[PDB]
Amino acid sequence: EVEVGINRLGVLRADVDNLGQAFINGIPDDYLSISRTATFSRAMSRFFKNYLNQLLAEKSYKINVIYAGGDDLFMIGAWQDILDFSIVLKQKFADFTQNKLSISAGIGMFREKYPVARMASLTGDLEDAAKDYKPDERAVQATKNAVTLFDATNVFSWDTLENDIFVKLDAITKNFEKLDETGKAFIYRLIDLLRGVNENQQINIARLAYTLSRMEEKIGKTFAQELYNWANADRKTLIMALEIYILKTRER
RNA sequence: CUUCUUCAGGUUGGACAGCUGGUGCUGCC
Ligand SMILES: Nc1ncnc2c1ncn2[C@@H]1O[C@H](COP(=O)(O)O[C@H]2[C@@H](O)[C@H](n3cnc4c(N)ncnc43)O[C@@H]2COP(=O)(O)OP(=O)(O)OP(=O)(O)O)[C@@H](O)[C@H]1O
Ligand SMILES: [Mg+2]
Ligand SMILES: [Mg+2]
Numbered sequence: 001e002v003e004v005g006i007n008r009l010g011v012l013r014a015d016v017d018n019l020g021q022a023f024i025n026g027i028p029d030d031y032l033s034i035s036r037t038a039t040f041s042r043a044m045s046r047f048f049k050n051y052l053n054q055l056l057a058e059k060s061y062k063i064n065v066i067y068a069g070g071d072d073l074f075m076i077g078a079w080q081d082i083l084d085f086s087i088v089l090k091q092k093f094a095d096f097t098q099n100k101l102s103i104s105a106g107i108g109m110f111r112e113k114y115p116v117a118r119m120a121s122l123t124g125d126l127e128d129a130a131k132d133y134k135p136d137e138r139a140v141q142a143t144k145n146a147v148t149l150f151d152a153t154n155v156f157s158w159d160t161l162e163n164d165i166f167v168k169l170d171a172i173t174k175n176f177e178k179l180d181e182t183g184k185a186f187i188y189r190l191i192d193l194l195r196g197v198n199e200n201q202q203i204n205i206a207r208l209a210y211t212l213s214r215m216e217e218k219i220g221k222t223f224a225q226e227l228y229n230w231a232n233a234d235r236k237t238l239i240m241a242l243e244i245y246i247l248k249t250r251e252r
Numbered sequence: 253c254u255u256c257u258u259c260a261g262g263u264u265g266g267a268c269a270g271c272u273g274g275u276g277c278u279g280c281c
Binding site: 112113180181182183184185216251252 | 271272273274275276277280281
């Protein structure tokens, strides 16, 4: 049903972080009652089932939800629908839970005949890679508040990190729709030369020099140097946002 | 039976310098 995009099947596995701990010791001991525990349980279950149904039915979503139940989530649908509903899910969970419970997800791209058992297993281990996220290896236990985006090693977050990646994605989508339609061939050049930076650095600074060299009447070099500015501090962020932009805008 | 057989300066200087278009589609689980 998509016109510009990719022919991949995206899935979502959202698991609330430390819900079992939120039941063991999350609720205050002084405010401990059977009615209050039942209220919290029913609120969470109603949230998941009912509000997932209503949130998808609010407007046209290409999602074919497999399971909501409780504390878990499975979804299969259009790849871009999975990506743009992950943010909706995180913001709705934050609003309903008042930013008290963390959630983790995992998204995988699959063909039209990929093994669905393999789909689920890969999405589960990506979910675990999102569950075991720690900015620093000093504090006990994991933050658990992360999302893996198509790879177990690509553990991004939902915080200001995801804010940055989505701001970058929106900016790139707005800017790079209308190039000269001929100089855009440098995009794959950048992608394949930034795939990993632990090796010959000569070509990276060479591409920087080439971008500086490119001089005509265009948007200018404001964003053409913002690419360089974002090409050093944010390496994995730039490659992830750029790959998301490419997959969204690929003429496939 | 004379008296120089060429000497001294400019050796390239500017202008453009790669643009446009396509850009993995079909067949199978
Ligand atoms: N009222 C109540 N219900 C359930 N467990 C309760 C309660 N009071 C105390 N406890 C204790 O908590 C743990 C729960 O462990 P578990 O039995 O594995 O059960 C599942 C699941 O049945 C239950 N669950 C899921 N959804 C709900 C809702 N909506 N309401 C109540 N209970 C619910 O919680 C467990 C889910 O396990 P995980 O998803 O793996 O936990 P996690 O948050 O994802 O951890 P992490 O991977 O992020 O680190 C028992 O000890 C029980 O006695
Ligand atoms: Mg859970
Ligand atoms: Mg669970």
